[PDB]
């Protein structure tokens, strides 16, 4: 899911959102971030906070 | 600053160009003297799809 969504918000919607007689552009699916998962334990491990 | 920096040299872009969205660099460009800028165009979009 991400994959591709990935491949279509960073190469596709962005020329479609633009593209001649097009409004409001909506993805199913979401573009890359850098998720970045905490661990709790590991969080009250060595004393840190997010 | 030599407590805690290490520099050295490189190369960089002076002029980062886009076009549409995404990274691009511009080519300016002649057809012969006596010739249809159509046929020149032609040619370019012969020798870019290699």
Known sequence: ?50 | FSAFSSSRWEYGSPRLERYNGLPSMEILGQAAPGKSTGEAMELMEQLASK
């Open chain 1, 1 to 50: 899911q991400e994959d591709i969504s990935d491949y279509v918000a960073a190469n596709m919607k962005d020329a479609i959102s633009r593209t001649s007689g097009v409004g409001d552009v909506q993805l199913f699916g979401s573009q890359y971030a850098m998720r970045i998962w905490m661990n709790p334990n590991e969080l009250n491990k060595f004393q840190l906070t997010p």
